[PDB]
Amino acid sequence: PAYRILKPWWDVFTDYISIVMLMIAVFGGTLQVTQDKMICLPCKWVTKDSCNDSTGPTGIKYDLDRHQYNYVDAVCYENRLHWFAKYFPYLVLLHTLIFLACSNFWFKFPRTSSKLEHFVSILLKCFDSPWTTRALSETGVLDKKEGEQAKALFEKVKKFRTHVEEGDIVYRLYMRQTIIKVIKFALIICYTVYYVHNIKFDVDCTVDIESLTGYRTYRCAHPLATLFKILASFYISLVIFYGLICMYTLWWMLRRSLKKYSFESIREESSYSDIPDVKNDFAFMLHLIDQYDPLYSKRFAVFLSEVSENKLRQLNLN
Amino acid sequence: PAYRILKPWWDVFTDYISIVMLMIAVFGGTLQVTQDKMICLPCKWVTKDSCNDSTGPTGIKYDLDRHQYNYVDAVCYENRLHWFAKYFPYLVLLHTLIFLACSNFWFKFPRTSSKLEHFVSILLKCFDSPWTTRALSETGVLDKKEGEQAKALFEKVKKFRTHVEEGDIVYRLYMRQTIIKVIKFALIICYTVYYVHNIKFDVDCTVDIESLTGYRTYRCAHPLATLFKILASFYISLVIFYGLICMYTLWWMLRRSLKKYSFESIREESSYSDIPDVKNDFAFMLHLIDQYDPLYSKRFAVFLSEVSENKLRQLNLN
Amino acid sequence: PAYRILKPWWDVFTDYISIVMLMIAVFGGTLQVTQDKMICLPCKWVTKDSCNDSTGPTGIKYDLDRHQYNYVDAVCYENRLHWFAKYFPYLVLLHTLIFLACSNFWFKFPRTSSKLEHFVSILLKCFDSPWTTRALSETGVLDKKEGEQAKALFEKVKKFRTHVEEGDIVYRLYMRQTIIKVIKFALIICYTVYYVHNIKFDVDCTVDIESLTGYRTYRCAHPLATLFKILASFYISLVIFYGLICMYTLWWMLRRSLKKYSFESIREESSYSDIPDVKNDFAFMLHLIDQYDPLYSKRFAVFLSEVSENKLRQLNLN
Amino acid sequence: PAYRILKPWWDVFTDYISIVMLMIAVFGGTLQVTQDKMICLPCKWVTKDSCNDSTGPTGIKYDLDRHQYNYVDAVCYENRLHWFAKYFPYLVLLHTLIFLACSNFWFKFPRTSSKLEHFVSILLKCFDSPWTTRALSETGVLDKKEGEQAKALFEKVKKFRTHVEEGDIVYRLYMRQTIIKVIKFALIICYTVYYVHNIKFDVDCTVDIESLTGYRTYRCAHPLATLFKILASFYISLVIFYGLICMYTLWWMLRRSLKKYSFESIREESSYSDIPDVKNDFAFMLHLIDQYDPLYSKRFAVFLSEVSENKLRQLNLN
Amino acid sequence: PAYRILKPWWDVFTDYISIVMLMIAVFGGTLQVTQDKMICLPCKWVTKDSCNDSTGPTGIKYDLDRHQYNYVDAVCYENRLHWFAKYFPYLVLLHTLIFLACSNFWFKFPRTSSKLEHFVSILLKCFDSPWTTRALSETGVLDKKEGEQAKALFEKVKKFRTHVEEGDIVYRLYMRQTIIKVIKFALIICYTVYYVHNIKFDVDCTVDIESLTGYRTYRCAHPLATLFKILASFYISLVIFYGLICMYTLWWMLRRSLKKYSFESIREESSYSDIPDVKNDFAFMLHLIDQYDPLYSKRFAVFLSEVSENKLRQLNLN
Amino acid sequence: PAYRILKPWWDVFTDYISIVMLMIAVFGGTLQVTQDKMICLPCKWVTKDSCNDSTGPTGIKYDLDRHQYNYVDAVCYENRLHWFAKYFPYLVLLHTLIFLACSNFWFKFPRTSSKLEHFVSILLKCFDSPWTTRALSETGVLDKKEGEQAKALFEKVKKFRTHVEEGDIVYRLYMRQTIIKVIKFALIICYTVYYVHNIKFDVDCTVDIESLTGYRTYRCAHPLATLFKILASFYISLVIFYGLICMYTLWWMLRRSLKKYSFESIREESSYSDIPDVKNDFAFMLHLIDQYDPLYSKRFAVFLSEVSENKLRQLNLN
């Protein structure tokens, strides 16, 4: 509903990229569950623990029952097949979940949710005030009721300023979240690229069970290897875009030095020099709202100015 | 809810065509997943890497187990079968998603969403104003309250004009989106038509595994080839309609030269010559609203006229 | 919500018949997907490309593997089985979708949706007016506020009349939609009845593959033939009802000659002779609302009369 | 929402019984689809087209492949198995749907829906009127506004009476619906009880195919016979309850002779003798509302009385 | 929404226990449907219609086809397996449904739903009245409007008292429902505990079919026996808790003798001795609301007192 | 909706951890249901009830049918496989459910839900009062209406204080719930860690059935052992976090000694020394609201002060 203005474009993009990652994860998961197959055969002639690979033709006879193939299938799936091809989608699901948690933690966390809902309530009831457009147009009789409403609103804004000025928690939380995203990004890229090549269609496996079948080695096929490879490539691509976005966010924030809102633009333009600069934890919100729309900041700044209140006193006193 | 007036008929048609494309994609996808079968047999007599195709009859005996057929099935599915027949529906899903993204990007993007929600809020509160129908009927006592509401509304419209006049971002974004749609259209038509013919029911494949079975070549059948061919034909047809719609949109926009709203019709008809012409990024919106219903433009234009304000001053002063 | 009054009983019936058709389509579709089986056997003795059909008994031995039966199954399913039994439900789904599109096109189309939402808004705010019941009861002090509301409402109705009088698009669209429904009805009845008989339980098929099996001909069974026959009969029955409804609609509209709303009933009854007749594109709406409830037309007609306005002037002037 | 008062207890019970019938239908349907099995075997020794039923033991050898059993399965399922055991749940679904249609037709039908929504709107705005409780308490200064509201309400009720008095359609529709329910009830009981006994676990079938297998007769088993028998018993029981309810409804309506609302109770009790009796199509509604709660009828009857209006004139005139 | 105050804690617990019972029923149902397996083998040596149970080892050869095992499976499943293991979850579902029906019958039943919605509407509009807190604080100028509202509210409460005093239906219905719950509880415990032990993993069955196979007896296994046993134990435990709750409810109601609300506490405390005792069918509601929160009863009792009305007359007369 | 302020951060974390636990439970459950497989083979040479594990190679022949493998599979699954590997996910589901019950019991329980909804209603209508910000700003003409509203609000707060002061039930319930969570935590950790190691891939089982097959021992494989081991590790980790959170909660509550709200901070700061200390069952709520946001406590405390009421008397009297 109302927190769309808080979320910037980068957070919006992350929100949908997470859905796409989760989608491919769920699909790979159900695809793994429904088949989870390998197709294994023996190898009669062995050379260095591998196949030699050396009147019409006739089929070869191995003298095996259907149920022994499934046993050797399960064994060569358990032991010699590599864990990544098994557990790829579960990991992706876990990662997407903890991304989303790192994103929405500071919304769900009450200490900050209270400050944010109070801030936005103040901002909207200020923007919807009637006296603002008049004050901006001035660069003369008004209703006593809305005059008193504005008068109480000034005091509310002052108390809110005094309350928010102390905290400085939101900056720290958002900082920690971005850093967690970036380090986790790097970590997943590392082992994903390192272990992607091990997915293969064909596998030789020597499991050492003579007594049950009488064959040493086996050659096996994993049909889903190609598809999981495609999904992994698409995955790491989306991940790359996500991490570049997070790096841009981090650079923006650390560069701006944004604990202090400079504010000088409006006071020179609108000729209200008697406005102080803002302190920590109330400037960050203004920067966020500025990324959405600069208009809200200007509409809110008028109540902060004491000159506006001094003028409003004249209209109530009349 | 309220953005239905912004969307023109072509965007409406695209919205439903995307749903149809997504529907056939999901269906082909689940159909591929649940079977993903081929039925492969050997070929005893070979001529040029192909079958010679040369007391009651008797069945032929190949001396193969059930589990070897599945191995050769997986192999001839992996190697010699063509990637398009495998991965047709996934590509279609991807394309539909990126179409929808290109369509709804300028709605979800905050810099423009703010301008649009502000514009439409202004337009609706102007259309719902009581003084408009009276002003149009004039071609005399009014309430001081609604008079002051209108008076503030003029100032709001002026500030909004000054704000929107600068940007010119919406035109660029919509331009880029249409062009992306058209080039992506052409690209998908190209390889889709080039590779559709390779889907076939029957396939000969030579995989070179003598040691496991003792047969060189194999003849295989893919039942879903016909159905995927039908779906691909239906797909490219829908795509053609989509691209022709996009071309019409592009021609309309580039032809109209619409940064400047000509406006001359109302001023001659309603005898309000003292209205300036509109500049970039506020005309495009008027053209869009004109495609929906011309009435909103006329109802909104009265507040822009200074003569209307001059007359309204007389009614408030009385 | 509010467009229920626009929809007549025939459109209501079509709306639910489409749901039933879609239901049987989805069911036949999933039933086709989950089995898609035939059961094929060879035929040892052949006479004219067909079976001769000529110490306890003993089973017959064909010397075939399980995997060859599936191959010949796929072949005799692809080639000699008839396309209608395969693709019956998909066609039904397509038809139902394009029926629904032809039904809801003039609602979703913005040029007409604007006129309709404006019309119905006017009608409801007129019906909810307090002065109407008094004016009808007359066959005396009123509030100045509601008097001015009614006075502005007369002007709104006049502007709306002048706006709607020109168009004549809604009649053309509804005409085209009904005709599309009727011609498509006839087309589907034609080939459905012509090709329904080809569905059969038992099929003889000669596919000409000696090298793979050594048998010429095959006898095959399709279990779902009976069920699809039942569904097709039920389908064509529902379709017949739909088409008869559409024919009734078409006859009604072409017979009534409804561009001109005759209107003579109320003016003779309520003694308001000074009301003009209505022109194109505003009469069609009145006929539709008359099919729902004649009361709305009478309650709306009073504002159109100039005598009512002349009398209302006396009450405001007092 | 508001039509709960219209629905009597019998219609409420029918509404839930239909859901239960639909539930068992859907369950039997999916159960039929997922198995649809029979298990068929041959019979070596035949006596009168039936089985004679005449060193450790040894298994019997029939020399049949797995794929021939499925063929004879499909054949003996198609031909000799009885259609009721196949198509039981589909019929039940159809019946439940047409029951629900017969129930909700007069709600969905616009000609009557308009009358009903208008009636209930009048009744609720009368019940919520403030003057009613005072008038009942009388067995003295009031607000001019609510006085005028009541005064207009009398005229609205009079116009509504004149409008509704003519129709007499609702009685005919409800009559037809009840009769359709009762005759359809009897019909389904008839063939359901006549054909339930044919469901059996074991079946002998002689299909006459020597050339494909060399056996004349077959003995087959249908596992779901018992379960479908249980569901059919439960079905006919629920149906019996439904039909007895419908018979009670029919007897009630035909006995009461309810076109004329007798009304004599309130006029003797509350001493308002000057109220006429009610005519057709406005009494039926009062009887329905009486079945829910008699209070609404009494609260509504006061406005119908002319004495109440005569007294209200004194309070407005003061 | 508003009936949460009517429901006591025991009804709340029953509501969730029914959901848990339904959950285990649905799970056991789908588990039964998807497998419904037994695994049957013959027994070569027989002693008293049972198995005697008496160079490497070698497998035993019975000379049976795959399709005969399924036949004997179906037979030994139909005949000798016990009906409880088959139809356990369906019964549980039926019981849960009829529990829920017995719980919500007096809400859905209109004759009582009208009384309850009217009662609660009165109670809430009384609790939200402004004069109540003042009257309680008294142990002096008020608005004429709210004074008249309260004055009409007294009359409404009096009429409602006279209406509700007669009925005494709600007590009878709730009594019948509790008793049905208790007797049905006892019945299900009886046969559930009596027949639970018959579920077993291993079963010997003698079906008497020599001609089809040549074996007399069979030994069979039912894998789901253990799981259904666990579910049945959990089921009867939940059922026990449910029945003990119902017994507590029954004892409470029969002990309290609650047709007469004693009421003596408030009149001694708040010094309003001039309040009569309450009669049947209006006391039961007060007891229910007392179980939720005693405050509503006290806030409502003030309007019942005539002294409160006598005092309120002085404030309106001033 | 409104109870988000009551829930602290620890309860929030528990709420989502329960969803994750339930998710892994449902997944392990469906995974168990769909396969529930073991793959068992015999062992020809036995040494101490275990396998000795001692011209191309040839397959071994056991002379067993497909249906005997399934029998021995079911037997070795029933008897020698350990119950934990079977019933792991059901237990997890049960635990998660009873965690959620212990969490939401005091919300669903009516005796406390009434007190809480009344408390929060009072708090919100106090926070939304206009006089509070003025009273805080004072560290002078007001509307008589809101003055009387505040005056009644003081009395409401006093009655509410007297009502809540007695109970002391909420503290006991929350205490019991935390303790149940901690003891159940310890219990599940105990047997989970004790029995996790018994899950294994390979199992030897001696079932003692010579007559049916002629083999003593069997070697079996359980593919899902690894996956269930991973899920169990992840489970116990989440559980550990949950229990540490619960221990922190318990330590906080027992340490604070919170029946008495110390309150001294505001009276020294805002110079309102004439406020008493709070008693049991009204302090706990204040501590909870303090964990969310301290501002509500301060905004509410002003009405509790008698000095504020004494000052408000002057403004109403004027």
Curated annotation (Swiss-Prot), chains A, B, C, D, E, F:
Free-text tissue specificity from the UniProt record: Ubiquitously expressed. High levels detected in the bone marrow; lower levels found in peripheral blood cells. Highly expressed in pancreatic beta cells.
Effect of residue 34 to W/Y/K/N: Impairs activity in hypotonic solution
PTM text: N-glycosylated.
Name of protein: Volume-regulated anion channel subunit LRRC8A
Record organism: Mus musculus
Shown part of the complete sequence: 15 to 408 of 810
Domain statement: The volume-regulated anion channel (VRAC) channel forms a trimer of dimers, with symmetry mismatch between the pore-forming domain and the cytosolic LRR repeats, a topology similar to gap junction proteins. The di-leucine motif is required for lysosomal localization.
Function: Essential component of the volume-regulated anion channel (VRAC, also named VSOAC channel), an anion channel required to maintain a constant cell volume in response to extracellular or intracellular osmotic changes. The VRAC channel conducts iodide better than chloride and can also conduct organic osmolytes like taurine. Mediates efflux of amino acids, such as aspartate and glutamate, in response to osmotic stress.
Annotated disorder: Defects in Lrrc8a are the cause of ebouriffe (ebo), a spontaneous mutation that causes male sterility. Spermatozoa present in the epididymis display severe malformations, mostly of the tail. A drastic decrease of the spermatid population is observed, whereas spermatogonia and spermatocytes seem moderately affected. Defects are caused by decreased volume-regulated anion channel (VRAC) activity in germ cells. Oogenesis is not affected but embryos derived from ebo/ebo females show early developmental failure.
Outcome (variant: residue 34 to D): Abolishes activity in hypotonic solution
Entry's family note: Belongs to the LRRC8 family.
Lineage: Eukaryota, Metazoa, Chordata, Craniata, Vertebrata
Subcellular localization: Cell membrane; Lysosome membrane
Gene for this chain: Lrrc8a
Record note on quaternary structure: Heterohexamer; oligomerizes with other LRRC8 proteins (LRRC8B, LRRC8C, LRRC8D and/or LRRC8E) to form a heterohexamer. Can form homohexamers in vitro, but these have lower conductance than heterohexamers. In vivo, the subunit composition may depend primarily on expression levels, and heterooligomeric channels containing various proportions of the different LRRC8 proteins may coexist. Interact with GRB2. Interacts with NOX4; this interaction prevents the ubiquitin-mediated degradation of LRRC8A.
Site (Required for anion selectivity): 66
Effects seen without this gene: Increased prenatal and postnatal mortality, growth retardation, and multiple tissue abnormalities. B-cell development is slightly impaired, without affecting B-cell function. Mice however show a cell-autonomous early block in thymocyte development and impairs peripheral T-cell expansion and function. Conditional deletion in germ cells leads to abnormal sperm and male infertility: the cytoplasm of late spermatids appears swollen, preventing reduction of the cytoplasm during further development into spermatozoa.
Source species, domain of life: Eukaryota
Transmembrane segments: 9-33, 87-105, 175-196, 227-251
Glycosylation sites: 52
